[PDB]
Amino acid sequence: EVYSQETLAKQVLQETFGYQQFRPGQATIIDAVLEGRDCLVVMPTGGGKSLCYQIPALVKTGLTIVVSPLISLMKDQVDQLLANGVAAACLNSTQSREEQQAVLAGCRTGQVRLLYIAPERLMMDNFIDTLGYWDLAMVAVDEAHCISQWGHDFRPEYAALGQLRARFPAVPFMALTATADDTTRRDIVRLLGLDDPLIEISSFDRPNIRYMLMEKFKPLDQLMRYVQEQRGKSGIIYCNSRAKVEDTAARLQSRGISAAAYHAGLEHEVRASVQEKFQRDDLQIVVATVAFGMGINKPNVRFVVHFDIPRNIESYYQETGRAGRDGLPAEAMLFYDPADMAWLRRCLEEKAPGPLQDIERHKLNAMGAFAEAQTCRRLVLLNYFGEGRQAPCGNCDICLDPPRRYDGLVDAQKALSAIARVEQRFGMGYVVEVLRGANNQRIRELGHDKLKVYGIGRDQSQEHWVSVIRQLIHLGVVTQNIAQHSALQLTEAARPFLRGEAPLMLAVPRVA
DNA sequence: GGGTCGGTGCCTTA
Ligand SMILES: [Zn+2]
């Protein structure tokens, strides 16, 4: 029968949307849902995510409920559908009671064909009761990765949508998202109760995006230099904390660079104005927390900067994926400091042990492995998402500037010697002063001139040496014990490196 | 030389 349903779908594709043909995989997804099967759609490339549920919604007789994470997303999606003559509506707190009653009346009557709604509203026990007295044709959960990303802590009603799926077993369910690795895919199936879903995964390759990493040495200065080299094209700078995004914004506005902070601490209409100025290109740069995310419709973001490393590869992929949507060259730049990773691990140890923390820890660890990789950045991303590839890309920082290594036994002995010289007590900021024998008070107030480690490594610049110590921490030769003021202690692997018995190769740092 | 670093959003009708 399959041919009959697709022709009805093809007609909707042409009549209400004006498009000519289905693109590869669109037909197979729409076919599946039109014959009653559940579906999980992971579409990082393709741009036809919304059509995958909106077209079967218009072919099926009955109501389609679209679960949506953001009020602004609901409104934008409803607006586009009404512009196409489709009877779409949404429900949210910003409406009046009279407005909501009219939406619900249209739902009972069937005037409304697609209803956009947040999980917190839909999962109310009495609301689900009134659903039974409608003609429900399909449920589609947009940005379904929220089920897993938020359903366990931030917004628990995202994990309750399975209760809805169990209440209406004969109504097909769709989960659709742009970013999801294997763990997230199975979690969506599990928490949503999809019954043997068709799983369709498109490619994660964005050839026009250039993945770049720079080691954080003087962060603000490097961030200043990178932006001033962008010569006024649009971009986003992500940081962790609201305080940081507010500070950095003011520093760039101190130069005359068009830049504005964005975070959830700002009143909402401020958020709408910054998002709108940015999108109409009257604002060059947005400094932002993760709050600046879903629903940003801007085709010409030319750079996305991560001033702080994200928590997992999915977040990094989704965030860098906002760049170069027009297909023209764009750049992703990550300012990496291993200290930011250890800060992220603390935040994780701060939470309850168990399987959820085990996964968050592995996701974090994989992100740190992406940052530390001495191989094509694109090969790490693609394979992490299960898309097998071995050919390096030629458009990452590893491919364009291959790593170069030098014998570090000399420099690492000079460093490993000077860190034992303090008896495990100084931090990295202290220890690197003695290796370049700069003149200051505690190198005499404690008496740290009468060591031959003082003034031994002025030969090379400051970035070179703290890079060495970071490399030794990564190899397990030095620890950073933050339980005693970030002092560098020495481990048991340190021994053969001071003796010169073990060979050692170190990479030069990432610098522009 | 400076994060002393968390951060994401629905929904309120006793
Ligand atoms: Zn590459």
Author numbering: 5 to 516
What text does the study give?
To better understand how G4 structures are resolved by helicases, the catalytic core domain of CsRecQ was crystallized in the presence of G4 DNA that included a 3′ single-stranded (ss) DNA loading site. Surprisingly, the 2.2 Å-resolution structure revealed a product complex of CsRecQ bound to unwound G4 DNA rather than a folded quadruplex. The RecQ/G4 product structure was very similar to the RecQ/duplex DNA structure, with a root mean square deviation of 0.68 Å among 511 Cα atoms. As was seen in the RecQ/duplex structure, the 3′ ssDNA is bound in an electropositive groove across the face of the helicase domain and it extends to dock in the ATP binding site of a symmetrically related molecule. Moreover, the helicase and winged-helix domains were closed around the unfolded G4. However, electron density was only observed for the three 3′-most guanines of the G4-forming DNA with the rest of the DNA apparently disordered within the crystal lattice. The 3′-most guanine base of the G4-forming sequence (G21), which is the first base within the folded G4 that would be encountered by the 3′–5′ translocating RecQ enzyme, was found sequestered in a guanine-specific pocket (GSP) on the surface of RecQ. The GSP forms hydrogen bonds with the guanine base using the sidechain hydroxyl and backbone amide of Ser245 and the sidechain carboxyl group from Asp312 of RecQ. These contacts are uniquely selective for guanine and, strikingly, they substitute for all of the hydrogen bonds that stabilize guanines within G4 structures. The GSP is capped on the 5ʹ end by the hydrophobic portion of the Lys248 sidechain and by Trp347 on the 3′ side.
